[PDB]
Design a protein around this ligand. Sequence first.
Ligand code: GNP
Ligand code: MG
Length: 165
Amino acid sequence: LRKFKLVFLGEQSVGKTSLITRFMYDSFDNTYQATIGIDFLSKTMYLEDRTVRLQLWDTAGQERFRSLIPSYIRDSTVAVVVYDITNTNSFHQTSKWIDDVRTERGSDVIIMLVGNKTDLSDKRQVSTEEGERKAKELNVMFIETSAKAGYNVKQLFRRVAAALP
Ligand SMILES: Nc1nc2c(ncn2[C@@H]2O[C@H](COP(=O)(O)OP(=O)(O)NP(=O)(O)O)[C@@H](O)[C@H]2O)c(=O)[nH]1
Ligand SMILES: [Mg+2]
């Protein structure tokens, strides 16, 4: 089968896992269950009217697990790097995650920068335009989402899939 190989990266608590579960299961939980190490989903699905093997690695944002991540980045055609629009540190820290992807794959990768939690726009600390500007500077795609609301979650996956050969 064709593969659709993604890795989710980003600081702790930004909503990596929640994006994945909203997409795959239409499921969201307010309760925080930290990802420990690297979790994995492999599923045969239909993409754009073809059978595709999804291989999705969901990494922990905690620094203590970061040493595990390079081999998973190496095997991933798509890297999804997530931040929380309410947390400026999480936004600036996307740089190291993108650098980690470049270290392993150079330009031979699709990267999507995601500003998540737009349902919390009252608490927004990073503008949409700041995100767009950073993405363009780094030569990566950009989207804003809300895993909680189910906003732009399917679109995230559609857009990275559309970039696959
Ligand atoms: N309001 C709101 N909360 C969200 C959103 N996405 C995730 N959360 C919340 O933020 C917390 C962390 O979410 P989670 O998906 O576990 O984040 P993660 O990036 O996978 N964390 P880790 O790196 O620890 O695995 C949870 O309490 C979850 O409910 C969102 O779009 N909006
Ligand atoms: Mg997680």
